[PDB]
Every structure is written in C-alpha cells, then in structure tokens.
Design a protein around this ligand. Sequence first.
Ligand SMILES: OC[C@H]1O[C@H](O[C@H]2[C@H](O)[C@@H](O)[C@@H](O)O[C@@H]2CO)[C@H](O)[C@@H](O)[C@@H]1O
Length: 460
Amino acid sequence: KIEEGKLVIWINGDKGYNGLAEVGKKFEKDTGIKVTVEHPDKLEEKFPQVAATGDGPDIIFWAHDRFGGYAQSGLLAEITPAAAFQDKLYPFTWDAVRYNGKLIAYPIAVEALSLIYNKDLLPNPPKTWEEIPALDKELKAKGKSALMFNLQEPYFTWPLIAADGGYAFKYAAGKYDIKDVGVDNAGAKAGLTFLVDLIKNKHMNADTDYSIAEAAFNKGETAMTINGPWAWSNIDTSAVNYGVTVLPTFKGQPSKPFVGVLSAGINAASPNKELAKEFLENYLLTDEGLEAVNKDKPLGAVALKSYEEELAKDPRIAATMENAQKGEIMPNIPQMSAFWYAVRTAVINAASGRQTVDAALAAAQTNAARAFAAAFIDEHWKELIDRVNNVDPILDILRQKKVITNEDYCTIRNKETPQKKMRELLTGPITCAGNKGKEVLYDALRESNKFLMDDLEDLE
Ligand SMILES: OC[C@H]1O[C@H](O[C@H]2[C@H](O)[C@@H](O)[C@@H](O)O[C@@H]2CO)[C@H](O)[C@@H](O)[C@@H]1O
C-alpha cells in the first residue's frame, strides 16, 4: 500500500514538479519525512483506479474539476484548515474545492488559457477569430502560419465552442442541471464549425497536439498559440519575444475558457494525512514554497493572497485573469469527466471529417449526460468483441449482478468462441439494460480483461 512515514506526490508533467520537489527536500530536512514527487502519464485517470484499492500517492495535484468525482467515490480526505489558514487564501478558490459542503482539497493556483503571440511576427494580434483565415494566408506567403495549438484536448478548443453560446451544464437555482447540456446548441455548432473549417481550408492540422504546437511556436514558425501559464517558462528559454493577451472574439462574443483551480487532494487511504497537511499548509502554501514551484513553471494566479499581490503586477497574469473573467469556473461535479470525454470525442470526429459537426455534437450532448463507462462501451464495442479473451467471468458477474438472466447466461455460455459470446452479449441483453448495464459490463471487463481495458483507455 502507501508507505508510512514518507509522502508520495503526483502532479502533471507540465507543472513545476522540480520546484515542488525542492519544497519536499526542505520538508525532509526539517522533519525526516522523505517526499517523492512523480508525474505519471494520465495520472487523473490512474488515481481513481489505484486509490480505490488503498494505493496511490499520498497527495494528488490536478485542476479542481476532477475532485468531485474522486470525493463522491470516497477517495479524498476532508480538509480541515484552521480559520487563520483558511483566511490566507481567496474565498473563491475555496469554493472550487468544496463538495457537498466539505473542503476536499487545498487550492493552489488559478489557471486560464490566453492567446500567446510572437510580437516580431505579429505586432498587433487579431481581435477576432474571423480574421484569422486571412491572416494565415498572409503569413503562409512569408513561410509562417497564423495559429497552432493542441487540438487533441477539448480544454483548448472549448473557449471557441463556448464563445457564442455553448455551455457544459446549465447553472440554475444554485445547482447544475445535467439536462441543459449546452454542447449542441446553435452557438456550440457555430464554434466547432468555425474550428472545423479552419482545418478543412488547411489553416490548421487535425493532428496537432501539445508538443507539436509548443515546438512550432517556440521556434518562431507560427505567429500564435493558445496555452496556460505553465507554458511561459519554455518560451522564456526560446528566442521568441512573446505577448500574452485576451483570446479573440467569435461573432462579437469573448472566448470563454473553462477556468481551473490547481488543487492538492489527500488520499483517503493515506496513513500520512497529518504529515500531508503539514507539508501543504506549512511548506507549500507559503510565499517561499509557491515561489519555488512558480520559478520552475509559472502557476498562474496563486490562491495565497500574500504571494498573489506580488504576481498580480505581471501583465501575463493580468491577461490570465482577463481571460478568466470572460470564461467560467469549471464545475467540480462527478459528471465532469463524462463531459470532457464527450467533447473530446466530438472534436476529434468532426475535425477528421469522420462525422459532421451536427452529429458529433449530438452524440456529445447525449454522452455528457450519462456515465463515462457507458459511453466508453458504446465507443469500443467492436474492438471489445474482437479482442476479449476471457468471457465466462463476465457472464458470471453479469448474472450475479442481475444484468442478464439465467437463460441469457446459459444461451451465451453455450457459444463456441469469445467473439461470438461477446457479440451476443453486446447486441442482446446489454442493449436492453440501460446505461447501468453498460457500467456493470465495464467493471466486469476490468476484473477479467484488464490489459485490454487499459490499452483501450491508453493507460498502458
Ligand atoms: O482537455 C480536457 C481536460 O481539461 C482540463 O485539463 C487541463 C488542466 O486543467 C491543466 O492544468 C493542463 O494540464 O491542461 C489540461 C488539458 O490538457 C481538465 O482539468 C481535465 O479534467 C480535462 O480532462
């Protein structure tokens, strides 16, 4: 399990993890408690898997939107800061980590996407998305491009989808309504259509990811990118003279980035909860602790009032907060991971021309409102049939969980190969047991065909 008397921290590989480890070394010097900082790939999807068995890190860092799902699953310990400490952070950052009345993490920093532009290539950046096609034509004439940013993560394309009316879950009467999903209204369709036309007309490439866009901007090959504060450090190191500014408007409306509060949660299974509290409150969330992390990769606008007063004078932070004000704080509700998966699928499918914009967003509207696991099954059902090897345990689990009947079990168990059993299952009783039946099937697959499931989720 988790080792007593030391701290293991998980944080994403784009953050200042080397600066965070320096805070860990100061902690160990004063206490004898070793602190190990790791940056596993896809840690936000690995954490609920390993923590459910009592494993994982003592502390997990991620934007707050994932933490409601974690807390609903019982994976996070309640945060209990004294009043003098709670006063040290902005109250709105505490609101981001409150779930069902309860603080479930320590807020660290406010993150929002901005437009980043090369001041030597583009002395005045475009105020509107609509002018970017013409700008790209001009820059292609000179051997450059207008704009490159990560098209593989919906976090980066959401500001444009939301600009003219898209939204995740409608907020009303103090609660999010998982009905009013707004990923398929006229504003969302217009934004994704504009994005998809950029790719169609060869102003962007559907295969551009984080590293490709970062490399191109930092080599001076593209005039603009979209990124967060963590990216400024690498541009500082490049030769690019860059500015950070408000995102372009679409149909006269501001782009609306989803605002994330980088947060540190304590594993409910950790035997080191008191050491973790001490590290986070007395070492990390101080002027010198946050400065060490921020010097490695900028955090954005920090939750710690005393340090934020210094950072707020940076014009790049002013741009971050200007974009933050035009966007929305992300919900932390458990449905957020289903929302993100739905929008990720829609953008990839529409950008490749595999689906029309309208069909992509119609699926996203349905998928955002149901469990992640159900959409996962529906999106991989052909691969499941072709690759599963171990079907009898699945049937046993489905029968004992009452998804299928005794007759179903005997009928399917009688077939000769795993592919035939799986096809009868997926086109028979699994189509008839709602989303819940597909969620039970997903759990059964992870108990019986874990490598297949890990590979399909790209966790291996
Ligand atoms: O793209 C979906 C993704 O968006 C957000 O993740 C951000 C994260 O907040 C930033 O700190 C940075 O690491 O970039 C990520 C996008 O690659 C959500 O926090 C995340 O839950 C969601 O899956």
